Ligand binder design. Structure first.
Ligand SMILES: Cc1cnc(Nc2ccc(N3CCN(C)CC3)cc2)nc1Nc1cccc(S(=O)(=O)NC(C)(C)C)c1
Length: 286
């Protein structure tokens, strides 16, 4: 395990939901030779949030994949999750900085990795719910990882969806329609959100091109709080979709639109998305 007293704070990496992640150095020999690790804690530690956190810890402990952030351990006194530190930060920030250096062939490499990591989760009947470029992390130039499992749920034995209505701010512009209407989350709603991730990447995180900004423009910025979700629901029901990003080939946009099917069952699987992305990659290399 990890001793609280040997964990030296370096910086805050992110703050969100009811938790934070910190860059720390675990230096149990106090000779400044310990490794830098990522440390996740709760901001305001409730009982329901701590039980979620414990499950989250067991979720990640159970996962071992090249494209999923490595579990290192836990720290007791208030529970803390110790993970590997990924030095290049979020795919969101990284893409925005190196937008002139990252070509479509690279975006597809990242996309394929995201798919493989996502398929590995579905293999364990884990539903991620929260997939976005902000929580996909960059280990190095040739490798990304799914970096946070804060909202990840296990499916019940007898069902292919999981129903959950959480209070507060929900990332609604990444959600499938049936998640907005019925609070149903599944592998197929993760596929929807993966479509939004694909979109993000191909916008190169241009600010005015983000899903919130695009959907808000399509709805009309004169909308307030609770009416937003309602109008979004209607737009999706009427086959309103995010536009093709500048420079996106039509066959990559086709992947996106196929992920965004209103019919939960007609969305592609993560194994087929990977095959299709890999095939497009292979053709761009020739
Ligand atoms: C598990 C994990 C391991 N290493 C790193 N490293 C990391 C993260 C961000 C940066 N950044 C962000 C801050 N910016 C100023 C510099 C680069 C650099 C390294 N980050 C990790 N995760 C993580 C970091 C920040 C935010 C998030 S998160 O997915 O947004 N989760 C919370 C914050 C809502 C709980 C996740």
């Amino acid at each position: 395990q990890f001793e609280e007293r040997h964990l030296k704070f370096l910086q805050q990496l992110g703050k969100g939901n009811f938790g934070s992640v910190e860059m720390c150095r675990y230096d149990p020999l106090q000779d400044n030779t310990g490794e830098v690790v990522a440390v996740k804690k709760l901001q305001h530690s409730t009982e329901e949030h701590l039980r979620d956190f414990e499950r989250e810890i067991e979720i990640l402990k159970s996962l071992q994949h090249d494209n999923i952030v490595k579990y290192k351990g836990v720290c007791y006194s208030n529970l803390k999750l110790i993970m590997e530190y990924l030095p290049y930060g979020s795919l969101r920030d990284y893409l925005q900085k190196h937008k002139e250096r990252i070509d479509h062939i690279k975006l597809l490499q990242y996309t394929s990795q995201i798919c493989k990591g996502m398929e590995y989760l579905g293999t364990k009947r884990y539903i991620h719910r929260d997939l976005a470029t902000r929580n996909i992390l960059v280990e190095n130039e040739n490798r990304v990882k799914i970096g946070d499992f804060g909202l990840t749920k296990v499916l019940p034995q007898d069902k292919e969806y999981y129903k959950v209505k959480e209070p507060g701010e929900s990332p609604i512009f990444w959600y499938a329609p049936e998640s907005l209407t019925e609070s149903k989350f599944s592998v197929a709603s993760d596929v929807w959100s993966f479509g939004v991730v694909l979109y993000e990447l191909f916008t190169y995180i241009e600010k005015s091109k983000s899903p919130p900004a695009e959907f808000m423009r399509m709805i009309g910025n004169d909308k307030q709080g609770q009416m937003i979700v309602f109008h979004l629901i209607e737009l999706l029901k009427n086959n309103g979709r995010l536009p093709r990003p500048d420079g996106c080939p039509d066959e990559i946009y086709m992947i996106m639109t196929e992920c965004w099917n209103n019919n939960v069952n007609q969305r592609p699987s993560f194994r087929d998305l990977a095959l299709r992305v890999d095939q497009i990659r292979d053709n761009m290399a020739g």
